[PDB]
Amino acid sequence: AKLTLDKVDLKGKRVIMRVDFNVPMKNNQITNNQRIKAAIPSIKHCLDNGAKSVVLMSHLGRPDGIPMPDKYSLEPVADELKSLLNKDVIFLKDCVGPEVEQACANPDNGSIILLENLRFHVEEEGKGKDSSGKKISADPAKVEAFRASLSKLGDVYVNDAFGTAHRAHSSMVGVNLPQKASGFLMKKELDYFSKALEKPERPFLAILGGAKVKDKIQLIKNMLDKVNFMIIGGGMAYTFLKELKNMQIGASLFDEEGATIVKEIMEKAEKNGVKIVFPVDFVTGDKFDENAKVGQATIESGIPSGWMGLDCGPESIKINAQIVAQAKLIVWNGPIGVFEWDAFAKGTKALMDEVVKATSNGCVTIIGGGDTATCCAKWGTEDKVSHVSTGGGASLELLEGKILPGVEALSNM
């Protein structure tokens, strides 16, 4: 119910656009430009529809309100965006100030400007830490001035930062312009999770993986009201198996608080006719390390003392392939094992292979932009699944039934 980019008359209008360019870095080098390319459509549309200019703003990492250009500058992003668009990008050393205001005041037609990390100013998040490491709160007056400054950089506001949509930060909800519309990425992201949560294909399978059960209670609960199947993998599994099967999980991390809610979780699944699938076997390590001694175990055998399950085993993989194959809609959020470590990545790799084939057979596959998105890029399956979200935290909120502050701040249709 929000104003969309394609419905705005951008003819000769300066466009101030919030995007999520917080991409994984390494030695000032980008290791994944997905979030960058994801914003291109909105940017191109603006320029192709007569926009006088397009000012881009985003955060990078967590500078906590302290200018750290030596390790958190968006300059590397400006260079990457320039190569992807084959069009010059004016990178400003800041996001506020007389210099920035002048540079965006009335740029030459077709100008693409990229501001510096918004989190170099405490006013963006509203809080942070000083040089000594002490948490500080931004001054109310400063926050208002910061938002008033950013608003002057454009005549029309566009928010395409789906990845940050869950953050009610200044650049996300404080821009005061007559028109505030969603970008192409923002709406594409929203529509996917909308249809999946309102008019889902069936069978409907949800794949949830994570270390703790506590932080996924509301997620699980909401999902059990619409899905037909649900696979729980990752560390959460050991909490369920221990409480439900009285399995000996050895040194496997246990979620004492999450286990208390396991009962009611299984009750709702039963009442909604949702078949929950847990692993039946696993790959163990004699310690929490990539080079740990590798072992094996089943529910019956349990896991030896001092050892922990870090991935599901061969029989579990076979079972997941069976459930994945009988689905027409799949929502995947969270790997099934420690994918970063080869010895415990087989489980997640197999699941990925099955999800890719599921797509080939006509299944709608939606991946939560998080660790699952990392896996897609890692194994090059980004173009083999229906949708790979650019925001894990944002999608999490949506799949929980919560609204996104970055969305609610936009103009209505």
Curated annotation (Swiss-Prot):
Q: Which residues bind ADP?
A: 210, 234, 339
Q: Does the keyword Mitochondrion apply?
A: no
The biological processes this protein is annotated with in GO are: flagellated sperm motility; glycolytic process
Q: What does this protein do?
A: Essential for sperm motility and male fertility but is not required for the completion of spermatogenesis.
Catalysed reaction(s)? Answer: (2R)-3-phosphoglycerate + ATP = (2R)-3-phospho-glyceroyl phosphate + ADP
What taxonomic ancestry is recorded?
A: Eukaryota, Metazoa, Chordata, Craniata, Vertebrata
**What is this protein identified as?**
Phosphoglycerate kinase 2
Family named by the database record: Belongs to the phosphoglycerate kinase family.
